[PDB]
Amino acid sequence: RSNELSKLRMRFFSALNHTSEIDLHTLFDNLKSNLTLGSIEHLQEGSVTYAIIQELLKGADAQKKIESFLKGAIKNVIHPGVIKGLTPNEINWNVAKAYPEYYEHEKLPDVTFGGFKVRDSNEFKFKTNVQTSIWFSIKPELFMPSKQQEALKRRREQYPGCKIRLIYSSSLLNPEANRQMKAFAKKQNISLIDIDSVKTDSPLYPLIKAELANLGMGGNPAAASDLCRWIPELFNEGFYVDIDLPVDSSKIVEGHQITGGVPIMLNMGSIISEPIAPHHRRQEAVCMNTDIIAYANDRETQVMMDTVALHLKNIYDDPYTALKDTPLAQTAFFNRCEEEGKNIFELRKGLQDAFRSDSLLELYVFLGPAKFKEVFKLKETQIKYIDDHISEFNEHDLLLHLISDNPSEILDFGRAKVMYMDIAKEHYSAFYKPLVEEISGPGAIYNALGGASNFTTTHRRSTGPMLPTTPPRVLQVFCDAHDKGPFVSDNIARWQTNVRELGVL
Ligand SMILES: O=c1ccn([C@@H]2O[C@H](COP(=O)(O)OP(=O)(O)O)[C@@H](O)[C@H]2O)c(=O)[nH]1
């Protein structure tokens, strides 16, 4: 009646850059029976449609050619694209494929991701309104700390009526924490799944129960959480999101549906390296994280989840191969555990006990001479003499050898000991994290889906609108759940981040 037609016309003239090489009033008029606001976005500078229009304006008969092109582009590519949940990149590629006379472009390369060839058909569909999170409590009295409760209250009470599913373990909570779990879930209309009574043939189910039963004995609940994410009976649609992740309102799509070229998508970015030999060129390496994971409503989802599940099973069965390039692998303790066939729980627990002993002699047995050398910055001859004589040393004798040999580094024996133990503790995190990250975590998944060399290529930029014509672009356009979904993550690098300026905590 009509302030809506007026917003539409202003968006249109704005998108096409207020040009008068043609008559935007007539073009507008001739397109408006089939023009919606959602379509205009794919007409702006940066889009393939815009770039075609710029070349068509330099041509004779601009007005009519532009009109024909746009009627067609909107009707057959863009508008069915918007209705289906396609991104600007997916729509751009679809225009390029439809108008090869107007947009020169290469073929879709052959890229494998989890045993599956990435497609540009847009056939995998994913719900954004179905969200599953995992909270395994390490405190029997406490079902979930307040911060995670509020995060759940916020995603709901901001953004219904998405469905919210919460996996937990009853067996980790005392009866009172349990009753409080059920009431929290009921009050917040959360679908609750107890991991203790779930039915599945997955190999990952015993590993999950064991990580949880082994709490206090090297078991880790983030590692159990990680594994749950590859069990088809638990995840077969919607999203996995870290319980703590925020929703960006403006990113919610109105059909609550997005698409992909693989049936399981993840949070992805990439790192541009320093120049490498022999041509002094930068490499782009794709990185991926499991803080956000999307699962298509489709049989191909179960097949990709089973390839990944067989890789994780493998790692739990022999973790030494997975941890081979990590810092813990340089220690005497890891060597020994490897001979002895210790499992990941004893590896983790052994590591913990060593840094809880408050004993430099025990730290030495753990680290061994090479790693003890590097950690306390010793000269070769100094560690050689320590190692030769270690079976004669008490705790003070070792301490006296450190003091003579360095500081620098850190006149009272009690304080000097603390200074030296605290230097050793600086390395704890670097020793521990991979025992989750490279076992069930983002490092294991990365390898399960293809690893370092499936996902690294020579960095090539441009030109103009991004199309999926090299392997990292294929993955950027078609396989990344973070960009396409409504959750925010600063947990890994964004796409095409220089290794120098990383921006991560
Ligand atoms: O006590 C815990 C700790 C974590 N986790 C699981 O492991 C993930 C931990 O990742 P974290 O949130 O610590 O990474 P961040 O949010 O800091 O990026 C959580 O989402 C949970 O699913 C859990 O179940 N219980």
Q: Is the CB of 116 under 6 A from ligand 1?
A: no
Q: How far apart are CA 373 and CA 384, in angstroms?
A: 9
What CATH homologous superfamily does 318-437 map to? Glycosyltransferase family 88, C-terminal domain (1.20.120.990)
Segments of 55-195 assigned E as strands: 112-113, 116-117, 124-127, 130-134, 163-168, 191-194
Point out which residues pair with 131 in neighbouring strands. Answer: 164, 239
Residue of the nearest CA to atom 25 in ligand 1?
A: 136
Phi (first) and psi of residue 38, to 5 degrees: -65, -20
- Measure the CA–CA gap between 291 and 271, rounded to whole angstroms: 18
Task: Determine the Cα–Cα distance for residues 266 and 258; give it in Å rounded to an integer.
Answer: 13
Q: Are 236 and 216 in contact (CB under 8 A)?
A: no
Q: What single string gives the DSSP state of each residue in 271-308?
A: EE-S-BTTTTB-EEEEEEEEEEEEE-SSHHHHHHHHHH
DSSP-derived secondary structure for 352-391: HHHHHS--HHHHHHHHHHHHHHHHTT--HHHHHHHHHTGG
Q: Which two tokens stand for residue 265?
A: 């998508």
Q: Domain 1-108 is of which CATH architecture?
A: Orthogonal Bundle (1.10)
* CB-based contact 81:40 (threshold 8 Å): no
The answer to whether 242 is annotated as binding is yes
The full length of the chain comes to 505
For the four alpha carbons of 254, 237, 494 and 270, in that order, the dihedral sign comes to: negative
Determine the straight-line distance between the first and last CA of the chain, rounded to whole angstroms. Answer: 53
Q: Is the CB of 211 under 6 A from ligand 1?
A: no
Nearest CA to ligand 1 atom 8: 222
Residue 170, SS3? Answer: helix
3-state secondary structure of 323: coil
Residue 156 is assigned to a ligand binding site:
no
Count of other CB atoms within 10 angstroms of residue 329: 16
Structure tokens given for 5? 């037609």
The H or E element that residue 425 is part of is helix 413-425
229 is in an annotated binding site: yes
Q: CA distances (Å), 384 to each of 331, 390, 394, 401, 420, in order?
A: 16, 10, 17, 12, 19
For residue 134, the SS3 value is strand
> Is residue 215 helix, strand or coil?
coil
Cβ atoms of 231 and 202 closer than 8 Å: yes
Q: How buried is 397 (Cβ within 10 angstroms: 0-12 exposed, 13-18 middle, 19+ buried)? A: middle
Other beta carbons within 10 angstroms of residue 401's beta carbon come to: 20
Q: Give resolution in angstroms.
A: 2.3
Determine whether the annotation assigns residue 134 to a binding site: yes
Closest CA to 208 of 169, 173, 164: 169
**Rounded Cα distance, 99 and 179, in Å:** 61
- Is the beta carbon of 244 within 6 A of some atom in ligand 1? yes
Kindly give the distance from the C-alpha atom of residue 483 to the centroid of ligand 1, in angstroms, as a whole number.
21
Question: Ligand 1, atom 5: nearest CA belongs to which residue?
Answer: 222
Q: How many helices (H) and strands (E) does the chain have?
A: 24, 12
> What is the C-alpha separation between 27 and 160, in angstroms, rounded?
40
Check the annotation: does 491 bind a ligand.
yes
> Exposed, middle or buried, 487 (CB in 10 Å: 0-12/13-18/19+)?
buried
CA count, 13 A, side-chain hemisphere, 191 = 10
Cα 324 to Cα 318, 329, 352, 502: the distances in Å are: 11, 6, 19, 26
Count of other CB atoms within 10 angstroms of residue 105: 16
Burial per residue of 181-204, b for 16 or more beta-carbon CB atoms within 10 angstroms, e otherwise: beebbeebebebbebeebeeebbb
Rounded Cα gap, residues 466 and 48, in angstroms: 9
CA of residue 115 relative to chain centroid, distance: 19
Q: Which atom of ligand 1 is nearest to the CA of 133?
A: 22
All structural domains of the chain with their residue ranges: 1-108, 109-317+438-505, 318-437
Distance (Å, whole) CA 69 – CA 90: 19
Question: Which of 212, 228, 158, 213 shows the shortest CA–CA distance to 188?
Answer: 158
**Which amino acid, residue 192?**
L
Residue 504 Cβ contacting ligand 1 at under 6 Å: no
Q: Which of 175, 183, 179, 225 is nearest to 204 (CA)?
A: 225
Among the listed residues 119, 111, 101, 15, the one whose alpha carbon sits nearest the alpha carbon of residue 65: 101
Task: Select from 164, 161, 214 the least CA-distant residue to 186.
Answer: 164
